[PDB]
Design an enzyme around this catalytic site. Structure first.
Site, PDB file in Angstrom:
ATOM      1  N   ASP A  90      26.896 -75.399  -1.137  1.00 29.92           N
ATOM      2  CA  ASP A  90      25.717 -75.718  -0.289  1.00 29.92           C
ATOM      3  C   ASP A  90      24.599 -74.694  -0.538  1.00 29.92           C
ATOM      4  O   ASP A  90      23.421 -75.103  -0.583  1.00 29.92           O
ATOM      5  CB  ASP A  90      26.114 -75.824   1.186  1.00 29.92           C
ATOM      6  N   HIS A 124      24.017 -77.313   6.518  1.00 19.02           N
ATOM      7  CA  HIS A 124      25.447 -77.559   6.182  1.00 19.02           C
ATOM      8  C   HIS A 124      26.140 -76.206   5.980  1.00 19.02           C
ATOM      9  O   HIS A 124      27.156 -75.945   6.657  1.00 19.02           O
ATOM     10  CB  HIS A 124      25.607 -78.476   4.960  1.00 19.02           C
ATOM     11  N   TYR A 128      29.342 -73.838   8.619  1.00 22.30           N
ATOM     12  CA  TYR A 128      30.620 -73.140   8.321  1.00 22.30           C
ATOM     13  C   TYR A 128      30.596 -71.779   9.021  1.00 22.30           C
ATOM     14  O   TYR A 128      31.617 -71.404   9.630  1.00 22.30           O
ATOM     15  CB  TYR A 128      30.858 -73.056   6.812  1.00 22.30           C
ATOM     16  N   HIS A 218      22.092 -88.291   0.339  1.00 22.39           N
ATOM     17  CA  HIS A 218      21.619 -87.409  -0.762  1.00 22.39           C
ATOM     18  C   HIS A 218      22.092 -87.990  -2.101  1.00 22.39           C
ATOM     19  O   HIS A 218      21.264 -88.131  -3.015  1.00 22.39           O
ATOM     20  CB  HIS A 218      22.098 -85.963  -0.576  1.00 22.39           C
TER      21      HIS A 218
HETATM   22 CL   LIG Z   1      21.328 -82.987  -2.278  1.00 27.50          CL
HETATM   23 CL   LIG Z   2      24.592 -81.659  -1.165  1.00 28.98          CL
HETATM   24 CU   LIG Z   3      22.957 -82.888  -0.354  1.00 29.91          CU
END
Ligand SMILES: [Cl-]
Ligand SMILES: [Cl-]
Ligand SMILES: [Cu+]
Ligand SMILES: [Cl-]
Ligand SMILES: [Cl-]
Ligand SMILES: [Cu+]
Lengths: 309, 313
Positions: A90, A124, A128, A218
């Site tokens: 990420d 994202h 975590y 995405h």
């Molecule tokens: Cl992406």
């Molecule tokens: Cl991603």
């Molecule tokens: Cu993404």
């Protein structure tokens, strides 16, 4: 002439700022036009990803403490390591991958959508952190970071994709951009869905589902844009790009299988995680407009894991 | 032998991905660590900008139709033109300026915060489209785009900043990044606040206040990071960079004055718009850690206009 054109349309004699910055200074810059949209798919995606805005603070991870405490120390360590591994992917995508796509956009709105992707993939990675803050000891958190830095099998995967982002081939950059949400994190996402299916860490799997709600769009979007651009090339150049996609996926599958065996073999989850990975490799190829070569047997997922998905 | 390191911490023998990508491939990559934060200012800024998430759909712009219909075609054209001009600057910042800052970050969290800025400045640009959709004819919208493309005085301003974003000097890139939210749009923001002080287009001014709630944090943050990096230069090189900031601001004030005279002279707003602009030029310098060289008289804002600016979103 039966058609009198008194003025020439501003759009066809101007460039977006990012084009001006990196590619073409022959004409003045145009402001983004959200009133005359070139591709309605851009507005649909913009509206969905902005309407789907969330922060990990929205989810009460504290409620997972009982089920977390039921998990043996080796399982807690596996989850912290797996999630810190996903945090790295990420971080790569948020800081390099998404923002690299902006200058290669087909449309004005696409430039803004990839800015949203960069931000949300950052969220994202941050989520975590929120999970670790609630569940993990400082020692577990620090150990996982050390393990990620020193794990050559893990590092090999982002190391293979980053060169496509920093190089000057926009189609290869777009394929790398699709591969991250389309394929590379599913081996890791197997673990929370496996656990959730057995009734452990339900609030954590709620965060994982919010992440996946973003990542599936995405992958779709990057695949959609790849397909529009590659369609304009000669049959020979289309054949060369299809060969490149399959060759790169083949390499990344090789690197992913090595990493997942190292991650999961001790727990007896490697075979199941790899099938889950290959299923998503198939969907990745479909979202680029190609056919999946993967067998039913090597992509088989347990119904209750599919249910969590 | 009392001081030998037998255990090297992961952080100091690894790099962030963006460092690996653009600067050094000799070390393995570390995942962002939100559990051990280097600069608590980063967490405060992250928390505020994410808590301040908004979309222009949130504001009932259609409630401005009565006051919009009171304005003649010349005033409606001025507003559409001014706002399409601000849309261009936001497009520059979102697609080039904020993105460019990520690889030059001092901390891991700063990389994510500039991704947030790129997105939210995208939302700022999108907000003008929402206003236009509600209030303007297709003719007014297209005319404003033609006007922006053909306006050399307008174009000169972003053309002056973009080279700093695409070049290899991260301090000059950072100064440009602070100048956009700190200074360059306030000449345009004068117009909606002038009108809302007289009870016209109040819902539009709510959108402008939501934009400003972001831009003041953007200016503060880029200024904060500039100050941390300039402090690591020799006193000689600190003096050189300070001179560059004043030289660049002097040039940009020159270009902004020309543009605002051209934009507003016909409506008698030029002088007051420029005073409002220089007030924010002063705030820009203060956020870079310098004193404002501008007089009270040069920066005078009518209290009813200042009330629209300072009002909380
Ligand atoms: Cl992406
Ligand atoms: Cl991603
Ligand atoms: Cu993404
Ligand atoms: Cl800005
Ligand atoms: Cl900004
Ligand atoms: Cu900004």
């Amino acid at each position: 002439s039966n058609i009198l054109e008194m003025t020439k349309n501003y759009y066809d004699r101007s460039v977006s700022p990012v084009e001006y910055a990196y590619f073409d200074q022959s004409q003045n810059m145009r402001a983004i036009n959200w009133n005359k949209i070139v591709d309605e798919k851009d507005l649909e995606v913009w509206n969905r990803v902005t309407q789907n805005f969330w922060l990990p603070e929205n989810i009460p991870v504290s409620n997972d403490l009982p089920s977390w405490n039921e998990l043996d120390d080796d399982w807690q360590q596996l989850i912290t390591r797996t999630f810190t591994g996903l945090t790295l992917l990420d971080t790569v995508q948020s800081s390099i991958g998404d923002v690299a796509q902006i200058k290669n956009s087909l449309t004005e709105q696409e430039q803004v959508i990839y800015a949203n992707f960069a931000f949300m993939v950052g969220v994202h990675a941050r989520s975590y952190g929120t999970i670790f803050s609630t569940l993990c000891t400082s020692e577990q958190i620090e150990e996982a970071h050390e393990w990620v830095v020193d794990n050559e099998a893990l590092q090999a995967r982002p190391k293979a994709l980053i060169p496509f982002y920093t190089a000057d081939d926009p189609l290869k950059s777009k394929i790398a951009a699709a591969l991250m949400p389309g394929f590379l994190l599913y081996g890791g996402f197997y673990l929370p869905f496996y656990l959730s299916a057995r009734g452990k860490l339900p609030n954590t799997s709620d965060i994982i589902r919010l992440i996946l709600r973003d990542k599936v769009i995405h992958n779709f979007y990057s695949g959609y844009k790849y397909q529009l651009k590659v369609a304009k090339l000669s049959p020979e150049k289309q054949a060369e790009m299809k060969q490149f996609v399959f060759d790169l996926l083949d390499k990344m599958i090789g690197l992913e299988k090595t990493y997942l065996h190292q991650l999961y073999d001790g727990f007896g989850l490697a075979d199941e995680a790899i099938r889950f990975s290959l299923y998503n490799a198939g969907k990745f190829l479909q979202n680029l407009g190609y056919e999946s070569p993967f067998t039913k047997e090597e992509t088989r997922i347990a119904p209750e894991v599919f249910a969590q998905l």
